[PDB]
């Protein structure tokens, strides 16, 4: 996020970090359950990747995180890799997440609710702060 | 490097697909929702993360970081996977597994 701000540690408890097997962060995700994570289909997550929950600082030589294995990847079959439409993937955890002060789930909307233009929302992540 | 070690956050407005089309045109599909162009931008590494809105006192997942400005221009709206459009699929998948 370009022109964002540092978040209060653990204030976005559903925020997860997806790491490949080299140990590097390649994408963000969200805990919707103790057993599931929702991310983008374009992220190309495999069962080789690990879900890191309860993290704030990636430079930590130790912090209280949960490295969780992925049991199965549920890609949306309508994902178009040319259009990038229907960009969603669900991840079923091998090992459930232990919910706590810093690890908890986000709410899901119904297909019928309306989030009107102009609504003030928030986005989070470990993406670049400058291009 | 321009990579933050600490989690970042940003407040931003949702846009109407119409207004979004002003910028991206034809690229905006039904299962997409735009946000920003208000002085903030999602950038490389934000992909897959949330777009949340408060509803009845609780935070709800409205979007998933999908794509946006080439240069992460803060005057260009970011594009997000519209969860309203995809949540039926989520619920049916959870109900079966």
């Amino acid at each position: 996020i370009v022109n964002g701000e540092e978040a209060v540690p653990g204030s976005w408890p559903w925020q997860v970090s997806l790491q490949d097997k080299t140990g590097f962060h390649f994408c963000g995700g969200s805990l919707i359950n103790e057993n599931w994570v929702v991310t983008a289909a374009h992220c190309g997550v495999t069962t080789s990747d690990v879900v890191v929950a309860g993290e704030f600082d990636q430079g930590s030589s130790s912090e209280k995180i949960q490295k969780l294995k992925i049991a199965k990847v549920f890609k949306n079959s309508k994902y178009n890799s040319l259009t990038i439409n229907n960009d969603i993937t669900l991840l079923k955890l091998s090992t459930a997440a232990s919910f706590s002060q810093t690890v908890s789930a986000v709410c899901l909307p119904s297909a019928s609710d309306d989030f009107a233009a102009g609504t003030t929302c928030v986005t989070t992540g470990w993406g670049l702060t400058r291009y | 490097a321009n990579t933050p070690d600490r989690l970042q956050q940003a407040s931003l407005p949702l846009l109407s697909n119409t207004n979004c089309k002003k910028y991206w045109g034809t690229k905006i599909k039904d299962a997409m929702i735009c946000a920003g162009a208000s002085g903030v931008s999602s950038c490389m590494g934000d992909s897959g993360g949330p777009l949340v809105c408060k509803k009845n006192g609780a935070w709800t997942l409205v979007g998933i970081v999908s794509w946006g400005s080439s240069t992460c221009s803060t005057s260009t709206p970011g594009v997000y996977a519209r969860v309203t459009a995809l949540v039926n699929w989520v619920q049916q998948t959870l109900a079966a597994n």
Binding site: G10, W12, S100, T102, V106 | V52
Partner: peptide, 10 residues
Amino acid sequence: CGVPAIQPVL
């Protein structure tokens, strides 16, 4: 769901 133990500050 959606109610953090540590409330978001902004």
